[PDB]
Write a sequence for this structure.
């Protein structure tokens, strides 16, 4: 479980 | 032309903030540095460590990075290992370059691995209808939402095991509720990242009496809140007079609320759109205006004040 | 239900496209696949390989990705090769999910996810005022802009050492000239990413006699071109006729050009401002409206289309 | 030299 790099919506 | 401005913001500036993200970019007070565009990161941290009271091992830099959903939040620095990168490059050629400066008070700052994440906690209070900053928190990503609740309770000054409702402040006008607390942070949040914000409040029927019961509703209010300036045309050189309205409001709603301030009928008021920004009144508004306040204040440039002119009418000829 | 649409688009669909990004989303033709939301990617590649008629080793998937900067572009597949990852996971719950499919002949070269970039090449012809798709290239990021100029000439059918002016098509109404050709790709472009587009043209004084001398002017011009449909409010179903205008036009201009098309004087026409979100006309539109046509039409969706009603009168 | 992950110059 890692985190994201960029947001997306 | 061979220098850049590095702006430092510290956690106390986040206190008292009532909007989205951590602070208001205009109104906040920064600590500023002139730095050579070819400076080293360790060189800047040295200068910073001397200027502020803190030693290098008691501070951590979180550059304020904008994101693709229109938010600006503390982010992770892209140093790590054999970097040797230049300041202007670390900034991706931004100047000024703003940075959140994490320190400790009153010891040493924890270690941050990446299986860990920094989160920001806000507590919404439906009685006072205000947000209350509750600091930030290092936590493994593998951790589950339920395991943070004690720290939220504690930081908000609540008794342990107080039942809370958790939202994620995603962007302005989108506050998604966290449904299942028995999943890990990476699954619990929409898109886990280091600027992410959990807002929380008490689960309580007592807060249904308030104007805005949930945080979700509160942010929806702030999103539309707009402060308009009302000036009398028949009185030249009139300052106003400032009223708090929604973009949503229609003519009757604008009319009745200005009327409840001027102490007159809403039928005795005559408004005038508009000026963006060739200041001065124009076309008078018919009282059957099918638009809304957002439409009336359409031509204003973003960092300009909203002025609407009005006129009081006679009640006998 | 537990099924999702997956639309494939092939590089042949980018040819002749005369606007921003690779293709017109509306007017392009897709190969559509219906897949279980829980499928493996492997399974999809297998059925796509079967259907499209290419071996799994001769193809490469670049999921189309709509951006908040106002563009839709091919992107690197997410798969952390390849811990389960269901198709609906890989698409961020997007249904349908569009994917650019790269084939080869009518083998495919290796691509280092970390150190290589895929870039797209358009050529602007200022004489004809038209864009010409010149394909896509794999190049190292470390590579200098200088070293891509030979390739740009080749694909546009130019002679070698032909002078070229370079831009990056960043987004609609933003085409940034590239000044220094002796820098890396990551330095030269705004935010280097797979699916970035650079537009090139001849460096020739001759084209200054063109109505639109550069790509910069061309795309700015395109941003403004806008179609709107005008209908009589009294009182038929919809006698619709659509006429081409600019977003820069004020009230006079839009009226004089719609009145001319109907044959009447503009003084005879009464436009009603589109209610927006709601159903019909509602508001009448003042002839001293100091705004533009962009402002009149920002209610209408992105689908869209653009339209507003009128009595005449 | 590396590629970015996300864009930034918004609508």
């Amino acid at each position: 479980g890692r985190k994201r790099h960029c947001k997306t919506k | 032309h061979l220098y850049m401005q590095v702006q430092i913001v510290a956690e106390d500036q986040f206190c008292g903030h009532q909007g989205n993200d951590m602070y208001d970019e205009e109104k906040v007070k920064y600590t500023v540095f002139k730095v050579l565009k070819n400076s080293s990161l360790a060189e800047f941290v040295q200068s910073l460590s001397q200027t502020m009271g803190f030693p290098q091992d008691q501070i951590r830099l979180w550059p304020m990075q904008a994101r693709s959903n229109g938010t600006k939040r503390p982010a992770m620095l892209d140093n790590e290992a054999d970097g040797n990168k230049t300041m202007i490059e670390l900034s991706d050629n931004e100047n000024p370059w703003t940075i959140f400066l994490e320190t400790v008070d009153p010891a040493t700052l924890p270690k941050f691995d990446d299986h860990d994440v920094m989160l920001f906690l806000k507590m919404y209070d439906p009685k006072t209808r205000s947000l209350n900053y509750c600091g930030h928190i290092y936590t493994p990503i593998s951790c589950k939402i339920r395991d943070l609740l004690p720290v939220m309770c504690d930081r908000a000054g609540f008794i342990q095991d107080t039942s809370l409702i958790l939202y994620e402040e995603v962007k302005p006008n989108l506050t998604e509720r966290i449904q299942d607390y028995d999943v890990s942070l990476d699954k619990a949040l929409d898109e886990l990242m280091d600027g992410d914000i959990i807002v929380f409040q008490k689960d309580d029927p007592e807060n249904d009496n308030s104007e805005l019961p949930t945080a979700k509703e509160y942010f929806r209010d702030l999103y539309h809140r707009v402060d308009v300036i009302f000036c009398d045309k028949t009185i030249p050189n009139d300052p106003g007079f400032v009223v708090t309205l929604s973009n949503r409001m229609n003519y009757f709603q604008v009319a009745k609320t200005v009327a409840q301030r001027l102490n007159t009928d809403p039928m005795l008021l005559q408004f005038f759109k508009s000026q963006g920004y060739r200041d001065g009144p124009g076309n008078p508004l018919r009282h059957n205006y099918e638009g809304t306040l957002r439409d009336l204040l359409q031509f204003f440039k973003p960092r300009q004040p909203k002025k609407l002119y009005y006129q009081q009418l006679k009640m006998k000829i």
User: Anything to note?
Assistant: The domain at 223-312 of chain B is CATH 3.10.20.90 (Ubiquitin-like (UB roll)).
